[PDB]
Amino acid sequence: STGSATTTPIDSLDDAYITPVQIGTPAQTLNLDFDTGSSDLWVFSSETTASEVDGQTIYTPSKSTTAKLLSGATWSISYGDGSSSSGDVYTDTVSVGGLTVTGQAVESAKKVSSSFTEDSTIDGLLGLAFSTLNTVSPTQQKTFFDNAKASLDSPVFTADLGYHAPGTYNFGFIDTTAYTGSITYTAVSTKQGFWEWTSTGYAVGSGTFKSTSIDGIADTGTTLLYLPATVVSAYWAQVSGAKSSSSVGGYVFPCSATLPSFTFGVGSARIVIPGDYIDFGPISTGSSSCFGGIQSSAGIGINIFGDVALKAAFVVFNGATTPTLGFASK
Numbered sequence: 001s002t003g004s005a006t007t008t009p010i011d012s013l014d015d016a017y018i019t020p021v022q023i024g025t026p027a028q029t030l031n032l033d034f035d036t037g038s039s040d041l042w043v044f045s046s047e048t049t050a051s052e053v054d055g056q057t058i059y060t061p062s063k064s065t066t067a068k069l070l071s072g073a074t075w076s077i078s079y080g081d082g083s084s085s086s087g088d089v090y091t092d093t094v095s096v097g098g099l100t101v102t103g104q105a106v107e108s109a110k111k112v113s114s115s116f117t118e119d120s121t122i123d124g125l126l127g128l129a130f131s132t133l134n135t136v137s138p139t140q141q142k143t144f145f146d147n148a149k150a151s152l153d154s155p156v157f158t159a160d161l162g163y164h165a166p167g168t169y170n171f172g173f174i175d176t177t178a179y180t181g182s183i184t185y186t187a188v189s190t191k192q193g194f195w196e197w198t199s200t201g202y203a204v205g206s207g208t209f210k211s212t213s214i215d216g217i218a219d220t221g222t223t224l225l226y227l228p229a230t231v232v233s234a235y236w237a238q239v240s241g242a243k244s245s246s247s248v249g250g251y252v253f254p255c256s257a258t259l260p261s262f263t264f265g266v267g268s269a270r271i272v273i274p275g276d277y278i279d280f281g282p283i284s285t286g287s288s289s290c291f292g293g294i295q296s297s298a299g300i301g302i303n304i305f306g307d308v309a310l311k312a313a314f315v316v317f318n319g320a321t322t323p324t325l326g327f328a329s330k
C-alpha cells in the first residue's frame with residue numbers, strides 16, 4: 001500500500017508546513033507538522049488546558065469508537081528551541097493520504113508551551129525520526145512510519161517541500177516524475193536517533209566548492225539551515241552590510257541586498273539553494289533589516305539541514321534495514 005498527502009506552508013515565509021491527518025473513527029482531521037527530527041505523534045486534544053488552546057483543532061478521544069487509553073503511559077518532550085508539551089497516550093487509527101495504521105500511539109497534550117499555543121495553524125506534530133527517540137514511558141512507542149513499514153510497497157517516504165507553494169509527502173513509493181536527473185543516495189547513522197548524514201562540502205554563489213565533511217541531520221521540522229560558524233561566516237561575508245546581531249540572535253542583512261545561492265554536496269552531486277530561499281524578511285514590521293535563513297549551529301551542538309535546504313531538493317528517506325537518504329534536484 002501507499003499514501004500521498006499535500007503539505008502546505010503555514011505562512012508567507014514557509015515557517016513550517018502542515019499536512020492533514022485523519023485520526024479516529026469517524027475521522028477527525030487535524031493539520032500536523034511532519035517532523036523528521038522527532039519521534040512523537042502528539043496532538044492538541046480535549047484534555048489540553050483550555051487557556052493553552054487558541055484556535056487549534058483538537059482531537060477528542062471520547063468521540064472516537066477506536067480510541068483506547070494506554071493505561072499508565074505518559075510522555076514529555078522538549079524541543080531544541082525550548083518548546084515542550086506533555087500528557088497521556090491513546091491508541092487509535094491514523095490515516096495519512098489514504099494509508100491507514102491501526103493501533104497508532106496518539107499522544108494527547110495536557111500541557112503545551114506558549115510557542116505552540118501562539119501557532120493557531122499547527123494542531124500537532126507527526127514525528128518521522130527513528131523510534132528510539134520516542135518519549136512514551138514506561139513502554140516506548142513506534143512512529144507512524146515504523147508502524148506502516150510492513151504494509152508499504154517500499155519502506156520509504158519522500159519529502160517534496162514547496163517554495164512559497166504546496167508540496168507532497170509520499171509514503172511507500174518514489175514518484176519518478178517529481179525530480180530531474182538521478183537520485184544520489186548517501187549513508188545514514190541512526191546512532192543518535194536522527195536521519196544523520198555527512199555532506200561533502202559547500203560553495204557560496206559562484207565560488208569554488210570547498211570539500212569538507214559536514215555532519216548534520218535532515219529535519220523537516222526545523223525552518224532554517226544551521227551550519228558551522230566557519231561556513232556561515234563565509235556565506236554572509238559575501239552580502240554587503242550583513243552582520244551578526246546579538247539583539248536579534250543571528251545574522252541579519254539589508255533588505256535591499258540580493259543574496260547569493262548556497263550549494264551543498266551530496267556525495268559527488270550538488271544541491272543548489274537559490275538565494276531567494278535564504279531571505280526570511282524584515283526582523284519587525286517596517287524594518288529595513290532582514291533575517292537570514294542560514295545561521296550558525298555553534299549554540300545548538302548539531303548541524304541541521306532544515307526546510308531552507310530540503311525544499312531545494314526531492315528527498316528520499318529510505319527506511320530499509322540499512323537506512324539511506326536520497327537527494328535529487330527538482
Ligand SMILES: NCc1ccc(C(F)(F)F)cc1
Binds near residue numbers: 037081219220302304
Ligand atoms: N525538529 C525536531 C528537533 C528539534 C531540535 C533538535 C536539536 F536542536 F536537538 F538538534 C533536533 C530535532
Ligand SMILES: NCc1ccc(C(F)(F)F)cc1
Binds near residue numbers: 016035037079115116
Ligand atoms: N522542530 C520541532 C518544532 C516544530 C515547530 C515548533 C513551533 F514552531 F511550532 F514552535 C517548535 C518545534
